[PDB]
Design a protein around this ligand. Structure first.
Ligand SMILES: [Mg+2]
Lengths: 137, 100, 100, 100
């Protein structure tokens, strides 16, 4: 009934290591008692706990030209429209109205799709590098 | 037959200039030039004297110079006049003229 | 010939618009749009002047504007007038018309 | 031409209805429906106005409505009138009529 008991159980089960017990108790405080906790190796001498909130998935860019924050080489928008496609966006006609909405409302657009082919990529990169449209695929 | 830039096509042959390909949509989205295809809207800049399908008189070309017309996909010949592109079609190959 | 939306077809070409594809049956079952195919029913919105089958006079088109016709499966040209799709056929390619 | 079910074919096109395929022999042996094929015997239910094979006058169609005819195995177009199947042929495609 207490997180101190959680820390005590994790400390006893880790051969009396109170740092492992404390870090498991902190992870279980943050993501919940029935949450997801994954162990992996570290490149640093000390153990560390990283909390990933929201919906983070391991898919990067499609075009490197979409970077609008050169400090971390990343794409950064706030209050952005999201266009989700179950199929790979291929035709130009399938991407022109979404860009028209995103430009008429003056709001960024994140296009999450199965893939984006060369024509739609060329339209997106041209509208980013020529007129300055806030888009990312 | 009408001659355009020292060029007069023979028989029922119509020389047209294709309209400029679109690059910016109505909402402000710029379009890539490579995915624009060929423009099917043209304007007639030269006409021939026509053909002899009926014996005796000569048949004038249905279109005239200064008419906007709709082109088919295939059937044109590229003519380079003063390093500018024009397209030669037949009189019967023209689909229809925009009237106003 | 009679023009439609500032477009007059040339010779014996006929511009029609396809009828709306069915989406719900008489029993009340909704249809998927990808299995609809191509609508063979149309109405004539523009006619041309016609061709010259014989010497002298010019032959008018058999159909007129406002006639419902049955189209063949193939033999039409897609014409985009103000971002709406119309189809250009020949006069002889029309299978028949519905009289009333 | 003579219309049928609000359908009048154009030019020298003949709309016919195929006869019912046989399912029982003269002795009493029933036939499977999947091996019947297409019936080459039909009856004329609609005729066109004919074709302009010669200049001036219009040529009537050789067959009239109510003639039993023999169809070639290729050359017909399927037409769905009142959810019933009919076939369009040319006037010259008809092989011969059964006279009585
Ligand atoms: Mg243990």
């Amino acid at each position: 009934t207490t997180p101190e008991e959680i820390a005590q159980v994790a400390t006893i089960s880790a051969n009396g290591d109170k740092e492992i017990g404390n870090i498991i108790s902190d992870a279980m405080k943050k993501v919940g008692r029935k949450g997801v906790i994954t162990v992996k190796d570290g490149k640093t001498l000390n153990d560390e706990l990283e909390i990933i909130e929201g919906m983070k998935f391991d898919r990067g860019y499609i075009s490197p030209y979409f970077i609008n924050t050169s400090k971390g080489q990343k794409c950064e928008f706030q209050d952005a429209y999201v266009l989700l496609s179950e199929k790979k966006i291929s035709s130009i006609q399938s991407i022109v109205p979404a860009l028209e909405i995103a430009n008429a409302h003056r709001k960024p657009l994140v296009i999450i799709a199965e893939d984006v082919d060369g024509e739609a990529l060329s339209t997106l990169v041209l509208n980013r590098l020529k007129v300055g449209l806030q888009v990312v695929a | 037959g009408q001659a355009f830039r020292k060029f007069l096509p023979l028989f029922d042959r119509v020389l047209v200039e294709r309209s400029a390909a679109e690059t910016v949509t109505k909402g402000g989205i710029m379009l890539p030039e490579k995915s624009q295809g060929k423009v099917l809207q043209a304007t007639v800049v030269a006409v021939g004297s026509g053909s002899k399908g009926k014996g005796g008189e000569i048949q004038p070309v249905s279109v005239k110079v200064g008419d906007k017309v709709l082109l088919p996909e295939y059937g044109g010949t590229k003519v380079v006049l003063d390093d500018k592109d024009y397209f030669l079609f037949r009189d019967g190959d023209i689909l229809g003229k925009y009237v106003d």
